[PDB]
Design a protein around this ligand. Structure first.
Ligand code: XA0
Length: 294
């Protein structure tokens, strides 16, 4: 590394390999993501560079965009653990409700900030939510999707997770809205509560049908325009909706109410991050200290 000192290979994300590195100068520890191929659109580097200006306590800071030797590196502030690992570690006992609430509240603040600045995430999942010992949780990878449209997969044979994809994306809609992030966060909220993924689809159609089996096959009544979506087929089976009391037990009515608003089929009826923050579910929100083993 011309300037860094690779500590370890954290992983291999959807846009390239990730390393924990120490800036031999500043001495700071950061996450270095090497972006995928043989050109790199200058349009992307400009859009990405804009993301450097985004500053919010619940958004992982993009410290630098390095375009040298014709390669693309993203330098991010470092956090020791992601929500996926934390949920696994908390599987036996479950994440306490007060902490689930704190995390959801913080993530909505982060989304409200991004959305008011016209930035969408598009690929929220537990792995993209980072946490620290102080009880904070932050969104990682905001805006990278748009600055790269949709490259389908990661870069080198790796099963793309569809579990958190909004139905409008699954139905072929070409224009994503802020609502896709609320849907993903709703799925994550449910998973923290039940300790099981809400919609663990194994294919795009299995994903769509798992959603339909739980929330009911959508129709023009609940989702005006759904039958005209690019990938909608009149041959879709028609399943009846289940009750939330059965979907995320034993979550209370405040929680079920908020979740139901985050999972409305019509992107336009789906609650905004701003509005969700005012929901009664957050009346008693606090900021608990999580039990992190690093
Ligand atoms: N900003 C970041 O801090 C970070 C970034 C990316 N990434 O995509 O650019 C990834 Cl993957 C993991 C990250 N940390 C969480 C983490 C740190 C570890 F040190 C570790 F071992 C682990 F599993 C998870």
């Amino acid at each position: 590394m011309e300037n860094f000192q690779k500590v370890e290979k954290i992983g291999e994300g959807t846009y390239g390999v990730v390393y924990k590195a120490r800036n031999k100068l500043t001495g700071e520890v950061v996450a270095l993501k090497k972006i995928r191929t043989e050109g790199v659109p200058s349009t992307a580097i400009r859009e990405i560079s804009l993301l450097k200006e985004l500053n919010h306590p619940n958004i992982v800071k993009l410290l630098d965009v390095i375009h040298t030797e014709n390669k693309l590196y993203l330098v991010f502030e470092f956090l020791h653990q992601d929500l996926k690992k934390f949920m696994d570690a908390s599987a036996l006992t479950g994440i306490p409700l007060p902490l689930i609430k704190s995390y959801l509240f913080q993530l909505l603040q982060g989304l409200a900030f991004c959305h008011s600045h016209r930035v969408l995430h598009r690929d929220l999942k537990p792995q993209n939510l980072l946490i620290n010992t102080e009880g904070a949780i932050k969104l990682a990878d905001f805006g990278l999707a748009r600055a790269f449209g949709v490259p389908v997969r990661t870069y080198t044979h790796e099963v793309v997770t569809l579990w958190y994809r909004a139905p409008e994306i699954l139905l072929g809609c070409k224009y994503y809205s802020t609502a896709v992030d609320i849907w993903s966060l709703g799925c994550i909220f449910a998973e923290m509560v039940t300790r099981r993924a809400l919609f663990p689809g194994d294919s795009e159609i299995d994903q769509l049908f798992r959603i339909f089996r739980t929330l009911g096959t959508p129709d023009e009544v609940v989702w005006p325009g759904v039958t005209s979506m690019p990938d909608y087929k009149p041959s879709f089976p028609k399943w009846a909706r289940q009750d939330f009391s059965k979907v995320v037990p034993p979550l209370d009515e405040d929680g079920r109410s908020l979740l139901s608003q985050m999972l409305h089929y019509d992107p336009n009826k789906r609650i905004s991050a701003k509005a969700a923050l005012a929901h009664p579910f957050f009346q008693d929100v606090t900021k608990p200290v999580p039990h992190l083993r690093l």
